[PDB]
């Protein structure tokens, strides 16, 4: 009975119940059985391991847990670890190392300074010493995971120690996992709070911005209750969608920089011009809704909220910064502004008839289908398909991403689900993997760039292998096509060895894979296939040959 | 003109003509066309890109270059990146940053702290901060990265930076090392002739031979002293081919899985009557480790390497020469000019059950034996290459360590594999690095169904590039090496650990545009290794196998 | 047997002798009576452990070693393991660390992550987990200790590992001479500079300290002999040529054109076409800038290490390999080569001369020059041929030191050049008389570098070790007061002035005699005095510099 037993039985005490990843010869020392109700997930590579426990500890609220062997092994876990340190997500990532009395950092075989590698880049990082001892660790792992700015935090284990009973006997201390995330708390918060109201009387026209911290807060309902009677608008992050339904009137969208070059429209105007409060409720730079995006038209009075000392004064200086959990926050502005009356909210109707006119667009075109008539056409079938509040869509990264954040349909908190703060391609699949286990009964689709699809393509064979029902839909153009973008703004012209594909038949590549799959090529095609996944009981990929024809002037906002 | 031009234009003064990798938004500064010479390689993943590199630098004995974007680029980059460090090869490794101003490492959006990361894993590694020093940046990264132990060098680029022009004018001369600079303690000679003294007493000297001693351009000279003395040569994984398939001192590669994969007491065959080991251009990475020599009677030991010992702890040789491996040969030729040749120790017994695998006649149930797999491999190898020529590529797995004992190398570097890091995924990158390194040589790739598909995508790669690859994927539904395990440590399996799925190999690659097909015995086999060999165009067999493994037999695992 | 037993032990096997330091806590599980021959040297502060351990490296040439206690014993041996780094000094540095199992930075009392803190300032730096491994951690730490460039490697000890001897029951191999890399075909490029080297008029050998590492000495000497090459050195690498060598062209300072009030740099400089930099290193602050007056200059670099510094000097010829080496097949190549007609410097040397020879009487105080020249010459008077050290802290009057001090022998003139952190004189004259017990040692120090260290006078009372200190005293940081001028036109005195401090008094109270001396006689007087007392001596001498 070793530390591989303390460890899962550990794991299991703070509420895990799956470890996600791919061993190596650490398999000698552990095998994933020692502990009922805690079972080992193989993926085809340690990226999706990563960002799967990424999304089930998002979704689920509780800390999550992956795994990966020594070397090599870390460093591709690494990548879905800084999924979670800039998205913000409590995983404990676990590694195996070299036996402890032959650790030689880049000499002995398979061993990489793991802890040095992995510190920069996560909440708490530490090497395994004295068997008895990873309980413990495991603890402090946790700690540190969930306390804002949540994350990452890693256990490196040399596999002599993983597997030896030294110092190992049989009753646990309590786990004491934080019910949510633990966050700082300045003294005087509630002072600046008043303030905040101070200002909120004043104000013509205020708005509510919304990032994933008000969520992990618990602060949902309240600042939806707030926003209703107060009629202050709330726009939102990329996964910040969802915290009000679809359809309710004070829902005015979600941001990106990139929103008024993909629609032609002066949107960040629009959505900002006559505002003279915003509140960023929950803020988080890493989200990149920065400030240059909000400071439209006439001068605005700020108002940062967050569990965080502000990490980016160089960047954001807020008129008021409260110090606070989110929930607190917005419970003592409530007290503060209970005399207060509704505003009049600012119209942003322009905005959203362009929005419609993209979704609905009825036109054929002589290359593949536009994006926004294949997120339509994914928005109609997920909300036949889920119950209402229900379902996600999940989106990997390319420049289709932006065209979710804009176009796709979130009827929950986390109900569009991407990596805001990371951005590996590749996201996509681990996503719904993680989305799908954390939500069981609820349909999951994934929209993904040929590009990072097949940075990750292989764990399709995971998916058809756990029976995860989710459908995939890639939208091919044989590039990368956000870097063509970029090539543009830059330079005014293309440069194809950098950023070209040859053809890849993605329905062929699915079904080697074991996932059945068929090709769209238009909103009729592409409504039968959506339908035809979401009711088959089993993965599904549809793949849709799309183009872009974009303007490479309209995107100065992201500079 | 920009950091970007002066950057590719100083990378193209130290030889450099590509550059692999997936660009990010940095695009918007570096477009890849600004100097002619040097062309921009893209790949599916960055790993990939990294191992493509490191495997050219290997083969052509200069600095190469990968590329990747800021944040998670640069951690997909970084396996890459540890793949070098730890089988030595000089990469430039080359990322995209956040904006100077805006570096605020995990708050700002894709901005990690890159140097921190990459420091712990390579020789050198900066974050530009004035555009124009990225010359001698460029300088520093090439210097530090083909000093001894070779490995990567790593710059960050922050995109504001690499677009800028500010003091840039419209260049010193490169002065890129030949060969690795390496460490040389005083009194090596002195050293060197008790190594001497010791092979005048010894009755069976060996040379263990690795990687090291092919980067210092000491090949011929070690096989002509080896000649003349006759002394055996044993090698490390990659050293395989210092001498020729069938030259009588070529005794073979070393492996820990040796006994218990020919079940037989192969390491004890191969050293228990030698009285004297000298591992020429010794390295523990390449994981030929004491333990494995230490077999029947106590032998004394000569270390040669360009480095100072690292690891007292596990190697204490009775002599430690650290010079250039060529420069000792040289002085050690003359102080054994008059010696009388030895009479070498009998391996005959281990060579007879080495060819009895190769030749392995029976048909199974379940699929080929890998053995036969490689067999026929190597038969269809020696028909297509040139005397010499060719590489057999492997990835890495059980079956990777009967390409150790099995597959030919009539060259240098003729068998491939990663030794140090061995990154499952190694094969396809490997691969394509080896066959643009030697244009005109078949290159043979071998993976399992684990690791091919950890890294499958980048057939795409294979296709776009129209590389002549032919990959032998053999495919037991397993993480085979990982259920081996399983079994040392606890004498069972658990299959949610080590356990897939059907995947379609064949169907997978005409996916990406390869063609392919399925073989089940070896006369189906050599055929599709024929057709493939002969088809100018990359090609893809996918070959069901099995291992029926003994967990008792890999006791020098420990 | 214990694990102390063990680390002084291999330290004994690499020939360590002596070990520097100030013992904490640790002393529980080690005492420092465990191997015969292998004595405790107490010191008043880390800081002098350190640094008296880097500058007994540096003339033996062999490993040295330091020891304080956890946490800030640890931080406080920093700094003379950051000396040990910049000034190239093979030093096995030890510091206790918090019981293994309860390792906690930040948080146990008195834990610091001292390995993180002390790998970015080192060669090597590691925690002992395993009690009997320390035998190898010592070796690994020689090993790299003794890699050019020679520096410090550090050893982390938590006290339970320390005296525990759970796992504890083969040669050393010392390096004689430090390890270094070399370049294929630095043969070629040798050659080269041979090439370049017919074709000058006025060459000159620039001849760093690595140069007396590597053994080199009596060759570059017989080399410039030979083809009349006169040879300037770093601070570190005066004395290669004995004082009166017709070739001895001295050591420059950047300051050295305003203190002679006579442009030096220039007389050195200005005409030389080729400059061979023997053993360079950046970090002695002989920068290329210094060389680069007059006309164009081709450059040739000689070094056992690859370029760190390719952004500051490219060399037109660049060899990287073992200085004697380097110098063997230089002589072979430029066996048939005629002397050179070396260039004019005459008027500098005459202008030094009458500098040293400056008899005025000030009302103020004496002058530096005048305090040198006196040093000078009872040094000359009490050291055999060849012998003796004259060590300099840091500070304005160490460039004095540079330009005027006699240095008749390598090493015969010590000062830090890479690291120049105050307090640097006590603990380097403590090295250097145990590393020259029967030679006369002088130690020059500056009031606000003197005091910063000024408590290890005790140490030198209780070592009864010989040095005769000569404090100079300004009641100012004089140099910082410099810069300020240099930078703003102006003083601004809180910033680098002092009250009084009576030096002798201090002395006094350490049981070091002691006595001030105002001119030119008072100072013979006291130097010849301090000389033939056989214990230790301090003089304090009011000075001014005026600028
Ligand atoms: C790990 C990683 N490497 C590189 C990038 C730069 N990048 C972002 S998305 C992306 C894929 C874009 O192509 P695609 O998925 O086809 O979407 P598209 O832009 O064509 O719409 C790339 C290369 C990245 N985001 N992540
Ligand atoms: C990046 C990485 N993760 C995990 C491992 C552990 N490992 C080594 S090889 C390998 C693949 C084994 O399966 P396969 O390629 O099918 O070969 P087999 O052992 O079945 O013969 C794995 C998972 C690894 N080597 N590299
Ligand atoms: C540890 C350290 N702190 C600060 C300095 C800056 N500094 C260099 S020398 C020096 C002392 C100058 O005063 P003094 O020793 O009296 O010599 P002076 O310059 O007056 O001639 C100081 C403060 C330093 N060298 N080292
Ligand atoms: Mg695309
Ligand atoms: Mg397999
Ligand atoms: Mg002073």
């Known amino acids: ?83 979670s340190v800039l998205d913000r997500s409590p995983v404990i ?24 590698i992995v510190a920069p880049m996560s909440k708490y990082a530490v090497e395994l010493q004295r068997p008895h001892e990873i309980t413990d660790l495991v603890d402090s792992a946790v700690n540190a995971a ?18 030896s009973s030294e110092g190992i006997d049989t009753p646990n201390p309590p786990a004491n996992t934080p019910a949510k995330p633990v966050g700082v708390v300045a003294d005087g918060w509630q002072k600046a709070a008043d303030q905040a109201a101070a200002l909120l009387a004043e104000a013509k026209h205020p708005v509510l911005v919304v990032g994933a ?46 929103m008024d070059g993909i ?132 989106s990997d990264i390319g420049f289709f991403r932006h065209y979710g954040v804009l176009f796709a349909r979130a009827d929950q908190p986390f109900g569009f689900l991407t990596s805001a703060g990371c951005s590996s391609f590749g996201y996509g699949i681990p996503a719904a993997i993680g989305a799908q286990m954390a939500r069981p009964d609820q349909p999951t689709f994934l929209i993904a760039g040929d590009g990072g699809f097949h940075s990750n393509s292989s764990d399709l064979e995971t998916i058809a292998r756990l029976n995860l029902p989710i459908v995939t839909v890639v939208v091919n153009n044989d590039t990368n096509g956000l870097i063509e973008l970029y090539q543009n703004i830059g330079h005014h012209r293309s440069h ?22 068929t090709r769209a090529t238009n909103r009729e095609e592409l409504l039968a296939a959506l339908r035809k996944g979401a009711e088959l009981g089993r993965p599904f990929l549809i793949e849709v040959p799309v183009n872009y024809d974009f303007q490479p002037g309209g995107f100065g906002a992201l500079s």
């Open 1 to 83: 009975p070793t530390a591989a037993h303390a460890l899962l039985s550990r794991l299991r005490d703070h509420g895990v119940g799956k470890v996600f990843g791919v061993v190596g010869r650490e398999a000698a020392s552990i095998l994933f059985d020692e502990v009922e109700g805690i079972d080992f997930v193989l993926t085809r590579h340690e990226f999706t391991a990563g960002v799967a426990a990424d999304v089930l500890a998002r979704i689920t609220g509780r800390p999550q847990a992956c795994w990966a062997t020594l070397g090599p092994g870390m460093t591709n876990l690494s990548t879905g670890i800084a999924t």
């Open 93 to 116: 990532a676990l590694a195996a190392q070299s036996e402890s009395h032959d650790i030689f950092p880049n000499d002995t075989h398979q061993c990489l300074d793991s802890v040095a």
């Open 146 to 163: 969930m306390t804002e700015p949540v994350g990452p935090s890693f256990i490196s284990l040399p596999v002599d120690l993983l597997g």
């Open 213 to 258: 911290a008000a969520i992990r807060s618990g602060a949902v309902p309240a600042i939806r209750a707030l926003a209703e009677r107060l009629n202050i608008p709330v726009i939102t992050t990329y996964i910040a969608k969802g915290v009000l339904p679809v359809g309710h009137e004070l829902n005015y969208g979600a941001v990106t920089g990139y």
């Open 263 to 394: 629609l032609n429209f002066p949107a960040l105007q629009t959505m900002f011009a006559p505002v003279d409060l915003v509140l960023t409720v929950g803020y988080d730079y890493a989200e990149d809704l920065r400030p240059s995006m909000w400071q439209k038209g006439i001068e605005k009075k700020t108002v940062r909220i967050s569990p965080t000392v502000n990490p980016i004064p160089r960047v954001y200086r807020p008129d008021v910064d409260v110090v606070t959990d989110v929930l607190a926050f917005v419970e003592h502005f409530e007290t503060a502004t209970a005399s207060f009356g509704a505003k009049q909210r600012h119209d942003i109707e322009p905005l959203r008839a362009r929005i419609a006119e993209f979704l609905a667009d009825p036109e054929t075109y002589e290359d593949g289908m536009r994006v926004h008539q294949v997120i339509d056409s994914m928005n109609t079938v997920m909300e036949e398909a889920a119950e209402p509040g229900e379902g996600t869509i999940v």
């Open 496 to 517: 194809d060895p950098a950023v070209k594909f040859g053809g890849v038949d993605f329905v062929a590549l699915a079904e080697a894979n074991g996932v059945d799959a």
